[PDB]
């Protein structure tokens, strides 16, 4: 589900995005007094914020809409489907929907089939740019990895939305790390404040790096509860690759 | 902020707690409150808990008006005796007095049918004359009870906003939504605000709707004292109906104070600017007389040439193309060609006299009868041709004065409560000659004479022709063209129960019941009568396939203004007669693409009734897309009826009763060719 109880730290950005996404949801009457239309979407460029998808699944979970991705990372690639019209038919039947690519986030064949997917979403943006079947059809890009150059280059911020997202709120390092500590078995004498604030410079992926790279020492010592010293070692275990 | 300290302040019923808690709510009442007044559960005890009572009633109506209510809100206002551009007064007056006075004026409007709503509605009149919100205080003060001088109590400074806006949307909603008894208040109160103010032509429209002589007299002395003139003379005579131009010519025949109202406004001066300007600034090519004058044959394309020549009036070459053109055609072509020279000479009384005098006292019957018709068409205010025509009409069995009665009575009826010619037409109605066109041009003559009567009339003339109509139930064409003149006499009604009287005596076998439904066609000129729309949809499945044609044909006359509701799915059915009902119901307006879109599907049909009926309204509603549809007619066609009619539409392809009567009488063309003798002398054109 990944509701608001599993994502936090972007209060200003959800306060700014409720007018981009939540506008056709609960207050569509401002079309006369304001004169707004359906934009292309929104994207967040920079380091991985450990929850780049939990936000889309969160707003989509509160909008009470379906989540249909394009690349089909989890058994949703051929379930719907020239494999280009079935997505628009399911988008016509299911008017509330949020599209977010996660799997896309050799240069000869990988850019060949990946160039076929890019041409697919380009002609889909041409069909949706020319005509429109129903509302509440918006696409969201993902620029968090290094191999993402087409989405960052083709979206400079001229006819789309752009958000500077290197330093989200420092809660992408602190409070979503606390949330990632709520799921796993957490003790009561831990202080995530210092170990969460003392990881500067490297990247924003310190949450997933310290959790996943700390699971090898919680798997080595076989401790029933995760201690702060495990995360302290995980800081070095993720700073060695820098 | 936090309501913890100030929340338990209203709970104690102590007088000091009220005299300091209520001023706090008045201070925080500028923006209403910080929330939606969720304290109802804690003030529902103060609801009944009453010296400084107007403040507690003010806060009570403030919270009850704040969260929700339907009747309990204005009671603290009517009991409060209100006392004591910012945001506070703009809110509590604008929106709180908007919804508040709206539900109070509505609940008192539908509740009782006291001066509380009067004095308070005048207080809102002043408050909204200070706030000055346009068309909103108006659009809400529409239905508030009084319908009196309050408008002149508001019409002091804002003249163009209230006139343009209020008269525009309140006139459109006063002819579409608001019924007639309040529209009379629009006519009298608009007579007040517009009589005391400027913009005379809209008051002249108030004379088009009132049909009174005091308005045109006051606007002729007020417009006479202030000195262009020819324009308001032109649409003055065009806008005035048959009643107020003879009442106008009798009060102006009394004084008129100027010699310019009789001399200028007597006759020939609505056409004296038209003819020379049309000859000077416009010039028609001779290819119309060349083509339409070159493909004439079969004695019917020549009839089309009698339509072109008959309604042409710059060029008069075909008129002066020698002789024998009248003799080559048929008898109806002898009437058409004999009346063409009279229809082209609506000017130069001496010239029309010296041109039609040749056909007078001729040897043929239709040359002299069409010559008297021409003498009736050339003018409409000379009335000196009455004696030579009427002097010989008394024959009663068979004589040339029967066709001379067709042309003389028809043209004399086009020239004009005239009692002498009607009492002379009484023996004509009693005659009942075999030719239907006698009672046709007689009933239509006196009918067009009597259009616009105040609440109709139940006089013994039309009562006499109703008795004679009930005498013998033969020759149903009498039961078709007599209700024409009857309904024309019933025209101008505002509250006449004459339709119900006809629903009492006239109701009989479906012939005179068809006359009754023709009275129903001339009984629903237009008001707020949605009961006739649901009753219309309920009666749309009648077995009688003619009362649907006429009663449903009335659609183009009833809703002639609101054209958004006129297009429907009538064509998708199988009742081609209804397809003709919409085909005629198109009209003569600017001709939007929806009408021509209906002419696209209605154009292609096999029966000559619909194929012959489609080009008339096709070219009447589009009068510059004229050549391509005619090429479509040439592609579909290539009998003689469609050829004569397609050349007719080739010619004429390029709210007064005078333009509404000829086609409504022309709705009976699906019969013998005898109607074609009267088809060429229609007055619906200019």
């Amino acid at each position: 589900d990944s509701t608001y109880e599993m994502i936090g730290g972007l209060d200003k950005q959800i306060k700014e995005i409720k007018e981009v996404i939540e506008l056709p949801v609960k207050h569509p009457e401002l079309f006369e007094a304001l004169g707004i239309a359906q934009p292309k979407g929104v994207l967040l460029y920079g380091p991985p914020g450990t929850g780049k998808t939990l936000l889309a699944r969160a707003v989509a979970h509160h909008t009470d809409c379906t989540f249909i991705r394009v690349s089909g990372s989890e058994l949703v690639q051929k379930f719907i489907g020239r494999m280009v019209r079935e997505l628009f038919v399911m988008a016509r039947e299911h008017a509330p929907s949020i599209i977010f690519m996660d799997e896309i986030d050799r240069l000869e064949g990988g850019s060949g089939g990946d160039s076929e997917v890019q041409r697919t979403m380009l002609e889909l943006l041409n069909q949706l740019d020319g005509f429109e079947a129903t509302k509440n059809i918006k696409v969201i890009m993902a620029t968090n990895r290094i191999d993402i150059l087409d989405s960052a280059l083709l979206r400079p911020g001229r006819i789309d939305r752009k958000i500077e997202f290197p330093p989200p709120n420092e809660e992408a390092r602190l409070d979503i790390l606390k949330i990632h500590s709520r799921k796993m078995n957490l003790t009561r004498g831990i202080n995530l404040r210092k170990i969460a604030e003392l990881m500067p410079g490297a990247s924003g992926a310190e949450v997933k790096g310290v959790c996943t790279e700390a699971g090898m020492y919680a798997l080595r010592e076989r401790r029933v509860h995760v201690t702060q010293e495990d995360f302290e070692m995980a800081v070095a275990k993720v700073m060695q690759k820098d | 902020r936090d309501k913890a300290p100030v929340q338990p302040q209203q709970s104690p019923a102590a007088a000091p707690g009220g005299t300091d808690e209520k001023p706090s709510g008045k201070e925080r009442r500028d923006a209403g409150d910080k929330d939606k007044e969720q304290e109802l559960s804690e003030e529902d005890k103060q609801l009944q808990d009453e010296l400084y009572r107007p403040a507690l009633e003010e806060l009570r109506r403030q919270i009850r008006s704040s969260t929700t209510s339907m009747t309990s809100v204005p009671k603290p206002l009517k009991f409060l005796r209100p006392h004591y551009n910012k945001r506070f007064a703009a809110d509590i007056i604008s929106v709180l007095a908007m919804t508040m006075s709206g539900e109070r004026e509505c609940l008192k409007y539908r509740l009782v049918g006291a001066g509380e709503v009067a004095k308070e509605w005048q207080e809102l009149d002043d408050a909204e004359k200070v706030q000055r919100e346009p068309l909103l205080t108006l659009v809400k003060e529409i239905v508030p009870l009084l319908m009196e001088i309050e408008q002149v109590d508001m019409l002091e400074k804002d003249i163009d906003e209230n006139a343009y806006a209020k008269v525009c949307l309140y006139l459109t909603s006063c002819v579409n939504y608001v019924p007639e008894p309040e529209n009379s208040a629009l006519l009298r109160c608009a007579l007040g605000v517009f009589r005391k103010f400027s913009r005379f032509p809209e008051a002249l429209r108030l004379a088009l709707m009132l049909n009174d002589m005091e308005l045109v007299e006051d606007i002729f002395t007020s417009c006479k004292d202030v000195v262009m003139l020819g324009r308001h003379g032109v649409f003055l005579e065009l806008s005035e109906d048959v009643e107020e131009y003879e009442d106008l010519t009798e009060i102006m025949s009394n004084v008129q104070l100027n010699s310019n109202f009789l001399a200028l406004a007597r006759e020939l001066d609505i056409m004296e600017p038209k003819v020379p300007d049309d000859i000077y600034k416009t010039h028609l090519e001779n290819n119309r007389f060349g083509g339409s004058g070159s493909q004439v044959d079969s004695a019917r394309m020549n009839l089309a040439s009698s339509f072109v020549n008959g309604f042409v009036n710059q060029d008069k070459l075909l008129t002066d193309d020698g002789n024998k053109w009248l003799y080559k055609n048929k008898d109806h072509g002898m009437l058409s060609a004999a009346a063409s020279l009279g229809m082209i000479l609506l000017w130069d009384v001496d010239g029309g006299l010296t041109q039609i005098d040749k056909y007078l006292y001729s040897s043929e019957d239709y040359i002299k009868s069409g010559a008297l018709l021409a003498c009736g068409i050339v003018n409409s205010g000379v009335r000196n041709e009455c004696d030579p025509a009427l002097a010989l009409l008394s024959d009663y069995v068979l004589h040339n004065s029967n066709t001379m009665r067709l042309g003389s009575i028809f043209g004399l009826g086009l020239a004009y409560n005239r009692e002498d010619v009607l009492t002379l037409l009484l023996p004509v109605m009693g005659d009942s000659k075999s030719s239907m066109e006698v009672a046709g041009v007689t009933a239509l003559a006196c009918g067009m004479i009597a259009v616009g009567s105040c609440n109709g009339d139940v006089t013994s003339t039309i009562l006499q022709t109703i008795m004679e109509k009930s005498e013998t139930e033969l020759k149903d064409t009498y039961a078709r063209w007599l209700p024409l003149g009857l309904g024309l006499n019933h025209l101008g009604k505002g509250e006449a129960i004459e339709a119900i009287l006809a629903a009492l005596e006239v109701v009989s076998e479906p012939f005179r019941s068809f006359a009754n439904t023709l009275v129903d066609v001339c009984a629903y000129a237009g008001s707020g009568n949605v009961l006739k729309v649901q009753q219309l949809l309920h009666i749309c499945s009648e077995h009688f396939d003619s009362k649907e044609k006429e009663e449903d044909k009335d659609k183009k006359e009833k809703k002639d203004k609101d054209k958004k509701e006129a297009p429907a799915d009538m064509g998708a059915h199988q009742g081609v007669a209804v397809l003709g009902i919409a085909l005629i119901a198109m009209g003569e307006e600017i001709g939007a693409e929806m009408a021509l879109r209906t002419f696209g599907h209605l154009l292609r049909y096999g029966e000559p009734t619909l194929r012959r009926a489609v080009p008339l309204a096709l070219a009447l509603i589009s009068v510059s897309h004229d050549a391509d549809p005619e090429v479509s007619y040439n592609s579909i066609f290539a009998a003689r009826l469609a050829a004569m009619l397609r050349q007719l539409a080739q010619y004429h392809a390029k709210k007064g009763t005078l333009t509404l009567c000829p086609y409504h009488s022309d709705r009976q063309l699906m019969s013998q060719v005898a109607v074609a003798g009267l088809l060429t002398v229609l007055v619906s054109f200019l």
Partner: protein, 233 residues
């Protein structure tokens, strides 16, 4: 400030298929069309000028010429398909927007040059060309397309943006301090989507305090984002 211009070109484009007495009897026959261009471009200015013909008619929209470089050099075959479908769909209006090895581009440009002129075709449909800048394209495309008359985008004459602002604000709620002369005079070379964009973000920014009425200070405060955004790059 372009009502006489839009009615002049409107009469220049409505004379075919409508009002035929002064189109074929007198012998006008301009079977070539016109060519348009806008300095701001964006397709919304030219779309707002040619949108007067889209009211009651059939319209065709082909934006950009990327479909030639993105694939192999198939040639003008797609233009031939648009030509045969324009012949089968004569009651329409042809409009092309965003008109932007080397030996093939020249031969398909000359073939498109002769094809656009229509040597073996009379007046059957109207073709209107549009691009960002007329100076970037070769001047050889002028004679086939523009043979009647061309028009350039005017300046902020304080009447066009005033009329468009009146249409967009025909039902909006604005305060009395919201003047118009500083807005229509301060702006320069802005399309309808720019004034509509600053009005949209102005109402959306005024909605942050549940204010149904937009003030002038919030309108200029919202305009600071567009004026600052256009100067950042």
């Amino acid at each position: 400030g372009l009502d006489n211009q839009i009615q002049e070109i409107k009469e220049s484009v409505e004379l075919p298929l409508t009002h035929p007495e002064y189109y074929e009897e007198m012998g006008i026959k301009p079977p070539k069309g016109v060519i348009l261009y806008g300095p701001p471009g964006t397709g919304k200015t030219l779309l707002a000028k040619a949108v007067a013909n889209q009211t009651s008619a059939t319209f065709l929209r082909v934006v950009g010429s990327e479909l030639i470089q993105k694939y192999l050099g198939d040639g003008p075959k797609l233009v031939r398909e648009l030509f045969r479908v324009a012949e089968e769909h004569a009651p329409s209006i042809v409009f092309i927007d965003e008109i932007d090895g080397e030996r093939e581009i020249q031969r398909t440009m000359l073939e498109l040059l002769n094809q656009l002129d229509g040597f073996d075709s009379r007046g059957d449909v109207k073709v209107i060309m549009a691009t960002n800048r007329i100076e970037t394209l070769d001047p050889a495309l002028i004679r086939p397309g523009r043979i009647d008359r061309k028009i350039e985008f005017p300046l902020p004459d304080e009447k066009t943006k005033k009329r468009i602002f009146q249409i967009h604000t025909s039902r909006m709620t604005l305060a009395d301090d919201v003047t118009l002369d500083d807005l229509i005079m301060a702006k320069d070379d802005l399309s309808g989507a720019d004034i509509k964009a600053i009005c949209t973000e102005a109402g959306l920014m005024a909605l942050r305090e549940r204010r149904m009425k937009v003030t002038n200070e919030d309108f200029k405060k919202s305009k600071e984002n567009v004026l600052y955004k256009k100067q950042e790059g």
